[PDB]
Subunit: 74 residues, 3 copies
């Protein structure tokens, strides 16, 4: 029966390797989700810097107009 | 009978493998999707770094007009 | 019978070996996405320092201007 035994052995080994593959996959999916979550945080930070910049540019616009006033008076 | 049961097991294994192969195919797509989103970011940063350059130069010039005014009054 | 079974087993083993290699690649691709993602909070922090510097420069400029207007 050693031919059949060898077969049943190889089968067990295959089932065992599958189990481990299914588990590596479940990990991989969480890693991807971990990377997905970080990626999503970025835009809000960029957006916030962008509002800050617009507000600086506004304040500089006004400053330039105050200076223009002062020049014309002196 | 011993053989029949080996044959069913082989059938199930091939089936589990078929599913695995579809899950991997899907995982790749999602890793390529994350490369796509990650990759927009650098250009965004550069656009900001350019506005900051503009701004630092406006300020320098402002500081210099102010210095000239202070000498005139 | 046995010869068919043996041949299918060999196919399955080489399918599994291929899957294990694809998994190994995928893990490297994920780790490299990770790295790129982690370089971002640094870039954002440096910008934020520049912005702080600029807002402090503006505050001071507004002060200079307010004092000029008092004199004239
Ligand atoms: Br990823």
């Amino acid at each position: 029966g050693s031919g059949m035994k060898q077969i049943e052995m190889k089968i067990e080994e295959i089932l065992s390797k599958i189990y481990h593959i299914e588990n590596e996959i479940a990990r991989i999916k969480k890693l991807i989700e971990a990377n997905d979550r970080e990626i999503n945080l970025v835009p809000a930070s960029i957006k916030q810097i962008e509002w800050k910049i617009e507000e600086i540019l506004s304040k500089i616009y006004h400053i330039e107009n105050e200076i223009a006033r002062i020049k014309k008076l002196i």
